Amino acid sequence: RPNHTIYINNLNEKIKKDELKKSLHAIFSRFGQILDILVSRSLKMRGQAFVIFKEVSSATNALRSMQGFPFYDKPMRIQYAKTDSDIIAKM
Amino acid sequence: RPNHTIYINNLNEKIKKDELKKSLHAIFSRFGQILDILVSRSLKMRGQAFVIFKEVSSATNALRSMQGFPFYDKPMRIQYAKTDSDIIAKM
RNA sequence: GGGGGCCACAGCAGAAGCGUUCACGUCGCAGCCCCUGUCAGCCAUUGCACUCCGGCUGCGAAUUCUGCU
RNA sequence: GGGGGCCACAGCAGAAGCGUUCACGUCGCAGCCCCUGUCAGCCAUUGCACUCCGGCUGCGAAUUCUGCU
Protein backbone atom coordinates (compact mmCIF):
# COMPACT_ATOMS: atom_id res chain seq x y z
CA ARG A 1 0.00 0.00 0.00
CA PRO A 2 2.33 2.78 -1.18
CA ASN A 3 1.21 6.24 -2.27
CA HIS A 4 2.38 9.83 -2.60
CA THR A 5 2.02 10.85 1.06
CA ILE A 6 4.06 9.37 3.92
CA TYR A 7 2.71 9.41 7.48
CA ILE A 8 4.98 10.04 10.47
CA ASN A 9 4.06 9.60 14.12
CA ASN A 10 6.08 9.27 17.36
CA LEU A 11 7.11 12.90 16.96
CA ASN A 12 8.08 15.20 19.82
CA GLU A 13 4.61 16.63 20.47
CA LYS A 14 6.13 19.49 22.50
CA ILE A 15 7.57 21.09 19.33
CA LYS A 16 5.91 24.23 17.97
CA LYS A 17 3.80 23.78 14.85
CA ASP A 18 6.00 25.98 12.66
CA GLU A 19 9.40 24.66 13.73
CA LEU A 20 8.05 21.19 12.98
CA LYS A 21 7.02 21.93 9.39
CA LYS A 22 10.38 23.67 8.92
CA SER A 23 12.67 20.99 10.34
CA LEU A 24 10.59 18.23 8.73
CA HIS A 25 11.00 19.90 5.34
CA ALA A 26 14.71 20.20 6.13
CA ILE A 27 15.17 16.48 6.83
CA PHE A 28 13.40 15.43 3.62
CA SER A 29 13.18 17.27 0.25
CA ARG A 30 16.61 15.72 -0.39
CA PHE A 31 14.50 12.87 -1.73
CA GLY A 32 12.35 14.79 -4.13
CA GLN A 33 10.12 17.80 -4.25
CA ILE A 34 7.89 18.15 -1.20
CA LEU A 35 4.44 19.54 -1.94
CA ASP A 36 3.21 20.23 1.60
CA ILE A 37 3.79 19.19 5.20
CA LEU A 38 0.52 19.11 7.15
CA VAL A 39 0.57 19.40 10.95
CA SER A 40 -1.80 20.25 13.79
CA ARG A 41 -1.24 19.97 17.55
CA SER A 42 -4.83 18.96 18.35
CA LEU A 43 -5.51 16.08 20.72
CA LYS A 44 -6.69 13.98 17.77
CA MET A 45 -3.48 14.53 15.77
CA ARG A 46 -0.70 15.80 18.05
CA GLY A 47 2.71 14.13 17.59
CA GLN A 48 2.25 13.22 13.92
CA ALA A 49 2.42 14.87 10.50
CA PHE A 50 1.77 14.28 6.78
CA VAL A 51 4.63 14.90 4.34
CA ILE A 52 3.26 15.02 0.79
CA PHE A 53 5.71 14.28 -2.02
CA LYS A 54 5.55 15.09 -5.74
CA GLU A 55 6.31 11.58 -7.04
CA VAL A 56 5.63 8.35 -5.17
CA SER A 57 9.24 7.17 -5.52
CA SER A 58 10.39 10.01 -3.25
CA ALA A 59 7.88 8.82 -0.65
CA THR A 60 9.21 5.26 -0.91
CA ASN A 61 12.79 6.55 -0.88
CA ALA A 62 12.37 8.68 2.24
CA LEU A 63 10.21 6.08 4.00
CA ARG A 64 12.84 3.34 3.73
CA SER A 65 15.70 5.80 4.27
CA MET A 66 14.54 7.84 7.28
CA GLN A 67 12.79 5.12 9.29
CA GLY A 68 13.63 5.27 12.99
CA PHE A 69 15.78 8.38 12.50
CA PRO A 70 16.03 10.47 15.71
CA PHE A 71 14.04 13.69 15.31
CA TYR A 72 14.32 15.96 18.35
CA ASP A 73 15.52 13.04 20.48
CA LYS A 74 12.71 10.75 19.33
CA PRO A 75 12.47 7.96 16.72
CA MET A 76 10.31 8.49 13.65
CA ARG A 77 7.63 5.91 12.84
CA ILE A 78 7.22 6.43 9.09
CA GLN A 79 4.60 4.64 6.97
CA TYR A 80 2.44 5.27 3.93
CA ALA A 81 -0.85 7.12 4.36
CA LYS A 82 -4.15 5.26 4.57
CA THR A 83 -5.36 7.45 1.70
CA ASP A 84 -3.47 9.83 -0.56
CA SER A 85 -4.05 13.41 0.53
CA ASP A 86 -6.96 15.17 -1.15
CA ILE A 87 -4.52 17.46 -2.96
CA ILE A 88 -2.98 14.40 -4.62
CA ALA A 89 -6.54 13.13 -5.06
CA LYS A 90 -7.20 16.18 -7.24
CA MET A 91 -3.85 15.59 -9.05
CA ARG B 1 17.76 33.43 61.80
CA PRO B 2 15.09 35.73 60.33
CA ASN B 3 15.78 38.69 58.08
CA HIS B 4 14.22 40.88 55.39
CA THR B 5 14.67 38.50 52.44
CA ILE B 6 12.96 35.12 52.12
CA TYR B 7 14.49 32.37 49.97
CA ILE B 8 12.33 30.04 47.87
CA ASN B 9 13.50 26.91 46.08
CA ASN B 10 11.71 23.86 44.61
CA LEU B 11 10.28 26.14 41.92
CA ASN B 12 9.22 25.00 38.46
CA GLU B 13 12.56 25.64 36.73
CA LYS B 14 10.85 25.44 33.30
CA ILE B 15 9.09 28.79 33.89
CA LYS B 16 10.33 31.86 32.02
CA LYS B 17 12.30 34.37 34.06
CA ASP B 18 9.76 37.18 33.64
CA GLU B 19 6.58 35.19 34.29
CA LEU B 20 8.25 33.98 37.49
CA LYS B 21 8.99 37.45 38.88
CA LYS B 22 5.45 38.46 37.92
CA SER B 23 3.54 35.54 39.42
CA LEU B 24 5.80 35.51 42.48
CA HIS B 25 5.04 39.18 43.08
CA ALA B 26 1.36 38.32 42.59
CA ILE B 27 1.34 35.59 45.26
CA PHE B 28 3.03 37.81 47.85
CA SER B 29 2.87 41.62 48.27
CA ARG B 30 -0.41 40.91 50.10
CA PHE B 31 1.91 40.61 53.08
CA GLY B 32 3.71 43.89 52.76
CA GLN B 33 5.61 45.93 50.25
CA ILE B 34 7.95 43.87 48.09
CA LEU B 35 11.19 45.62 47.19
CA ASP B 36 12.53 43.25 44.53
CA ILE B 37 12.26 39.65 43.35
CA LEU B 38 15.62 38.37 42.11
CA VAL B 39 15.75 35.42 39.70
CA SER B 40 18.17 33.83 37.24
CA ARG B 41 17.85 30.55 35.35
CA SER B 42 21.56 29.70 35.51
CA LEU B 43 22.68 26.20 36.47
CA LYS B 44 23.90 27.54 39.82
CA MET B 45 20.56 29.14 40.69
CA ARG B 46 17.78 27.71 38.50
CA GLY B 47 14.55 26.78 40.32
CA GLN B 48 14.90 29.32 43.14
CA ALA B 49 14.37 33.03 43.77
CA PHE B 50 14.87 35.80 46.34
CA VAL B 51 11.84 37.84 47.39
CA ILE B 52 12.99 40.96 49.26
CA PHE B 53 10.48 42.58 51.61
CA LYS B 54 10.34 46.09 53.07
CA GLU B 55 9.89 45.08 56.72
CA VAL B 56 11.01 41.80 58.26
CA SER B 57 7.53 41.03 59.62
CA SER B 58 6.21 40.67 56.06
CA ALA B 59 8.97 38.13 55.40
CA THR B 60 8.02 36.18 58.53
CA ASN B 61 4.32 36.52 57.66
CA ALA B 62 4.69 35.22 54.10
CA LEU B 63 7.21 32.53 55.11
CA ARG B 64 4.87 30.93 57.64
CA SER B 65 1.80 31.57 55.48
CA MET B 66 2.90 30.39 52.02
CA GLN B 67 5.03 27.39 52.99
CA GLY B 68 4.38 24.37 50.79
CA PHE B 69 1.90 26.30 48.66
CA PRO B 70 1.61 24.83 45.12
CA PHE B 71 3.22 27.20 42.61
CA TYR B 72 2.87 25.97 39.01
CA ASP B 73 2.10 22.45 40.25
CA LYS B 74 5.08 22.38 42.63
CA PRO B 75 5.46 22.97 46.39
CA MET B 76 7.38 26.00 47.60
CA ARG B 77 10.27 25.49 50.03
CA ILE B 78 10.42 28.89 51.73
CA GLN B 79 13.09 29.88 54.26
CA TYR B 80 15.00 32.95 55.37
CA ALA B 81 18.09 33.99 53.43
CA LYS B 82 21.58 33.12 54.65
CA THR B 83 22.40 36.83 54.44
CA ASP B 84 20.14 39.83 53.90
CA SER B 85 20.40 41.03 50.31
CA ASP B 86 23.01 43.70 49.68
CA ILE B 87 20.24 46.22 48.98
CA ILE B 88 18.94 45.68 52.52
CA ALA B 89 22.59 45.70 53.62
CA LYS B 90 22.81 49.28 52.33
CA MET B 91 19.44 50.07 54.05
C1' G C 1 18.82 38.92 15.15
C1' G C 2 24.49 39.85 15.49
C1' G C 3 29.62 39.11 13.37
C1' G C 4 32.95 37.30 9.62
C1' G C 5 34.10 34.73 4.60
C1' C C 6 33.31 32.56 -0.48
C1' C C 7 33.92 31.66 -8.34
C1' A C 8 29.14 33.13 -4.92
C1' C C 9 28.22 37.61 -6.80
C1' A C 10 27.68 43.78 -13.01
C1' G C 11 26.77 48.94 -10.54
C1' C C 12 23.23 52.44 -9.46
C1' A C 13 18.18 54.29 -9.69
C1' G C 14 12.95 53.63 -9.98
C1' A C 15 8.45 50.27 -9.97
C1' A C 16 5.79 46.33 -8.26
C1' G C 17 5.51 42.00 -5.06
C1' C C 18 7.27 40.47 0.13
C1' G C 19 9.47 40.72 5.25
C1' U C 20 9.42 43.04 9.90
C1' U C 21 5.11 45.18 12.43
C1' C C 22 -1.12 45.04 16.31
C1' A C 23 -1.31 48.08 11.62
C1' C C 24 0.29 51.40 7.98
C1' G C 25 5.01 55.08 6.90
C1' U C 26 10.37 55.08 7.39
C1' C C 27 13.33 50.81 6.68
C1' G C 28 15.07 46.13 4.98
C1' C C 29 14.67 41.35 1.11
C1' A C 30 19.80 36.86 -4.33
C1' G C 31 22.92 32.18 -3.15
C1' C C 32 25.56 29.02 -0.16
C1' C C 33 29.83 28.70 4.49
C1' C C 34 31.51 29.75 9.64
C1' C C 35 30.85 31.83 14.57
C1' U C 36 27.04 33.59 17.59
C1' G C 37 22.17 36.88 21.40
C1' U C 38 17.91 34.87 21.49
C1' C C 39 13.99 30.96 21.25
C1' A C 40 13.17 25.62 21.39
C1' G C 41 14.29 20.21 22.14
C1' C C 42 16.02 16.23 25.12
C1' C C 43 19.91 15.63 29.21
C1' A C 44 21.63 17.08 33.78
C1' U C 45 20.78 19.87 38.15
C1' U C 46 16.82 20.65 44.89
C1' G C 47 20.75 24.39 43.98
C1' C C 48 21.79 30.99 49.25
C1' A C 49 22.59 34.67 45.11
C1' C C 50 22.31 40.46 44.05
C1' U C 51 27.87 40.53 37.47
C1' C C 52 26.95 37.31 32.22
C1' C C 53 27.83 31.76 31.85
C1' G C 54 25.99 23.53 32.33
C1' G C 55 26.37 19.64 28.28
C1' C C 56 24.38 18.03 23.51
C1' U C 57 20.98 18.96 19.52
C1' G C 58 17.91 22.15 16.24
C1' C C 59 15.23 26.50 14.17
C1' G C 60 17.64 31.23 13.05
C1' A C 61 12.96 35.54 7.78
C1' A C 62 11.90 38.75 2.91
C1' U C 63 12.64 38.82 -4.80
C1' U C 64 10.89 40.09 -9.30
C1' C C 65 10.48 42.80 -13.62
C1' U C 66 11.92 47.99 -15.58
C1' G C 67 15.80 51.92 -17.00
C1' C C 68 20.71 54.35 -17.00
C1' U C 69 26.36 54.43 -17.10
C1' G D 1 -4.20 41.12 22.34
C1' G D 2 -9.90 40.77 21.70
C1' G D 3 -15.04 41.55 23.80
C1' G D 4 -18.36 43.24 27.62
C1' G D 5 -19.50 45.76 32.66
C1' C D 6 -18.78 48.76 37.30
C1' C D 7 -19.72 54.60 42.58
C1' A D 8 -14.94 53.15 39.16
C1' C D 9 -14.60 57.32 36.53
C1' A D 10 -15.06 65.95 35.02
C1' G D 11 -14.56 66.95 29.33
C1' C D 12 -11.36 68.43 25.66
C1' A D 13 -6.55 70.20 24.00
C1' G D 14 -1.31 70.61 24.42
C1' A D 15 3.51 69.18 26.91
C1' A D 16 6.67 65.83 29.00
C1' G D 17 7.58 60.78 30.69
C1' C D 18 6.28 55.49 29.06
C1' G D 19 4.35 51.22 26.03
C1' U D 20 4.41 48.74 21.47
C1' U D 21 8.60 48.34 18.04
C1' C D 22 15.02 45.74 15.57
C1' A D 23 14.63 51.32 15.77
C1' C D 24 12.49 56.01 15.24
C1' G D 25 7.35 58.48 13.11
C1' U D 26 2.06 57.51 13.12
C1' C D 27 -0.46 55.36 17.18
C1' G D 28 -1.80 53.92 22.08
C1' C D 29 -1.11 54.41 28.18
C1' A D 30 -6.02 55.77 35.26
C1' G D 31 -8.56 51.82 38.57
C1' C D 32 -10.69 47.31 39.58
C1' C D 33 -14.64 42.88 37.42
C1' C D 34 -16.14 39.09 33.70
C1' C D 35 -15.43 36.31 29.13
C1' U D 36 -11.67 35.24 25.76
C1' G D 37 -6.96 34.50 20.61
C1' U D 38 -2.52 33.74 21.96
C1' C D 39 1.78 32.14 25.08
C1' A D 40 3.16 29.08 29.32
C1' G D 41 2.66 25.29 33.37
C1' C D 42 1.53 20.41 35.00
C1' C D 43 -2.04 16.32 33.37
C1' A D 44 -3.66 13.22 29.65
C1' U D 45 -2.87 11.32 24.82
C1' U D 46 1.35 6.68 20.10
C1' G D 47 -2.99 9.13 17.79
C1' C D 48 -4.43 8.45 9.42
C1' A D 49 -5.84 13.84 8.83
C1' C D 50 -6.23 18.01 4.69
C1' U D 51 -12.13 22.84 8.72
C1' C D 52 -11.16 25.40 14.31
C1' C D 53 -11.47 22.46 19.11
C1' G D 54 -8.75 17.61 25.46
C1' G D 55 -8.94 18.67 30.98
C1' C D 56 -7.05 21.87 34.92
C1' U D 57 -4.00 26.01 36.26
C1' G D 58 -1.46 30.82 35.37
C1' C D 59 0.63 35.26 32.86
C1' G D 60 -2.33 38.60 29.76
C1' A D 61 1.57 45.85 29.01
C1' A D 62 2.01 51.75 29.12
C1' U D 63 0.85 58.02 33.53
C1' U D 64 2.21 62.60 34.98
C1' C D 65 2.09 67.71 35.22
C1' U D 66 0.01 72.10 32.18
C1' G D 67 -4.34 75.08 30.00
C1' C D 68 -9.47 75.94 28.29
C1' U D 69 -15.10 75.47 28.59
From TrEMBL, chains A, B:
GO terms for MF: RNA binding
Keywords, ordered alphabetically: RNA-binding
UniProt domain RRM: residue ranges: 4-83
Superkingdom field: Eukaryota
Transmembrane annotation, as ranges: none
Family membership: Belongs to the RRM U1 A/B'' family.
Protein name: U1 small nuclear ribonucleoprotein A
Taxonomic lineage: Eukaryota, Metazoa, Chordata, Craniata, Vertebrata
Full-length numbering of the shown residues: 7 to 97 of 142
